Design an enzyme around this catalytic site. Structure first.
Site, short mmCIF file in Angstrom:
data_model
loop_
_atom_site.label_atom_id
_atom_site.label_comp_id
_atom_site.label_asym_id
_atom_site.label_seq_id
_atom_site.Cartn_x
_atom_site.Cartn_y
_atom_site.Cartn_z
N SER A 45 0.78 -1.24 0.00
CA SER A 45 0.00 0.00 0.00
C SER A 45 0.80 1.28 0.00
CB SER A 45 -0.98 0.04 1.15
OG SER A 45 -1.97 -0.95 0.99
N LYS A 48 -0.18 3.69 -2.75
CA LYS A 48 -1.26 4.65 -2.67
C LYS A 48 -0.80 6.09 -2.81
CE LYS A 48 -4.12 1.38 -0.19
NZ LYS A 48 -4.62 0.91 1.11
N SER A 105 -5.43 3.79 4.87
CA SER A 105 -5.06 2.67 3.99
C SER A 105 -6.30 1.90 3.54
CB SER A 105 -4.02 1.74 4.64
OG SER A 105 -3.16 1.22 3.63
N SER A 212 1.69 -3.24 3.82
CA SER A 212 2.00 -4.59 4.21
C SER A 212 1.22 -5.56 3.35
CB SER A 212 1.71 -4.82 5.68
OG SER A 212 0.35 -4.61 5.95
O1 LIG Z 1 -4.28 -6.45 7.00
C1 LIG Z 1 -5.44 -5.83 6.42
C2 LIG Z 1 -6.54 -6.87 6.29
O2 LIG Z 1 -6.07 -8.03 5.57
C3 LIG Z 1 -6.51 -9.25 6.19
C4 LIG Z 1 -7.01 -10.21 5.14
O3 LIG Z 1 -7.89 -9.47 4.30
O4 LIG Z 1 -5.51 -9.91 6.97
C5 LIG Z 1 -4.24 -10.01 6.35
O5 LIG Z 1 -3.38 -9.09 7.01
C6 LIG Z 1 -3.22 -9.36 8.40
C7 LIG Z 1 -2.28 -8.33 8.99
O6 LIG Z 1 -1.01 -8.38 8.35
C8 LIG Z 1 -2.67 -10.77 8.61
O7 LIG Z 1 -2.55 -11.03 10.01
C9 LIG Z 1 -3.59 -11.79 7.96
O8 LIG Z 1 -3.08 -13.12 8.16
C10 LIG Z 1 -3.70 -11.44 6.49
O9 LIG Z 1 -4.60 -12.34 5.86
C11 LIG Z 1 -7.59 -8.80 7.15
O10 LIG Z 1 -7.80 -9.72 8.23
C12 LIG Z 1 -7.01 -7.48 7.60
O11 LIG Z 1 -7.95 -6.65 8.27
#
Ligand SMILES: OC[C@H]1O[C@@](CO)(O[C@H]2O[C@H](CO)[C@@H](O)[C@H](O)[C@H]2O)[C@@H](O)[C@@H]1O
Ligand SMILES: [K+]
Length: 263
Positions: A45, A48, A105, A212
């Site tokens: 991201s 963005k 984000s 991330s």
């Molecule tokens: O991180 C944003 C959003 O992504 C989700 C999946 O849509 O989770 C992902 O990111 C998390 C944080 O890094 C991870 O822990 C997870 O395993 C990964 O799938 C959502 O749960 C999150 O809100």
């Protein structure tokens, strides 16, 4: 040559288990510190910033563009939509979408910016227009965050992104009003206190955008106003070998700390 700062960044990287990329520009003297500065990393991201900036550039020739409403439908919601989900079956302006993308984000908001630019290639085209030959955006959110090792999609280098972030926020890639708006947005980021900001002295001011994705990808790009020094631009990108790896914002903070101690 390998500098002392590069030595320390290499020691951090080896203790982290992943791959670290760093680029600093110090505008006091235009000097640069690079670590894997010409290797590609998945932006996640952090991309963005380029999308918001591209819409700001369009607004230079349309004074009302940032007040243009964009419909948000239930089908538009993706994986992370903290602002857009409140507006489903309603509208958000391009300014609201830019603020939501940058400061929260919001991925639906990013996708609206990309659509306003004609797709991912429109963001790449803006990058080219402002002299960035490295950046590429290939996909929308969330799939631009897959961050697969070796995949060139949705990547840039630390060197290229630091140069671009400087031109956008401190230079003249945007008009004066637009540059100021971008800086205001970055300075109001909600997501950055554990990343670059965590490695810097508290007295310094930061505007940043985090990112991330999979492979434990943990990124931050920042414009910094040190106490009593000319501004810096700092890019820190980090990615790991396993798809399910955890985020390591502390590694970014440690990189920033090394850079600050080396000034
Ligand atoms: O991180 C944003 C959003 O992504 C989700 C999946 O849509 O989770 C992902 O990111 C998390 C944080 O890094 C991870 O822990 C997870 O395993 C990964 O799938 C959502 O749960 C999150 O809100
Ligand atoms: K992750």
């Amino acid at each position: 040559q390998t500098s002392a700062v590069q030595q320390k960044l290499a020691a951090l990287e080896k203790s982290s288990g992943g791959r670290l990329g760093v680029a600093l520009i110090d505008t006091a003297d235009n000097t640069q510190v690079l670590y894997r500065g010409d290797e590609r990393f998945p932006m996640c991201s952090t991309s963005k910033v380029m999308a918001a900036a591209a819409v700001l550039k369009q607004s230079e020739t349309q004074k009302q563009l940032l007040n243009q409403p964009v419909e948000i439908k239930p089908a538009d919601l993706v994986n992370y939509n903290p602002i857009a989900e409140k507006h489903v079956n309603g509208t958000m302006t391009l300014a609201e979408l830019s603020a939501a993308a940058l400061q929260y984000s919001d991925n639906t908001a990013m996708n609206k910016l990309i659509a306003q630019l004609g797709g991912p290639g429109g963001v790449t085209a803006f990058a080219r227009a402002i002299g960035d030959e490295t950046f590429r955006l290939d996909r929308t959110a969330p799939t631009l965050n897959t961050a697969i090792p070796g995949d060139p999609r949705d990547t840039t280098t630390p060197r290229a992104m630091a140069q671009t972030l400087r031109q956008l926020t401190l230079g003249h890639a945007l008009g004066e009003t637009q540059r100021a708006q971008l800086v205001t947005w970055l300075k109001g980021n909600t997501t950055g206190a554990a990343s670059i900001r965590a490695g810097l002295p508290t007295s310094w001011t930061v505007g940043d955008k985090t990112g991330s994705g999979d492979y434990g990808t943990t990124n931050d790009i920042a414009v910094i106003w040190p106490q009593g020094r000319a501004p810096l631009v700092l890019v820190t990108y980090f990615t790991q070998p396993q798809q399910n790896a955890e985020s390591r914002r502390d590694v970014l903070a440690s990189a920033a700390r090394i850079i600050a101690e080396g000034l």
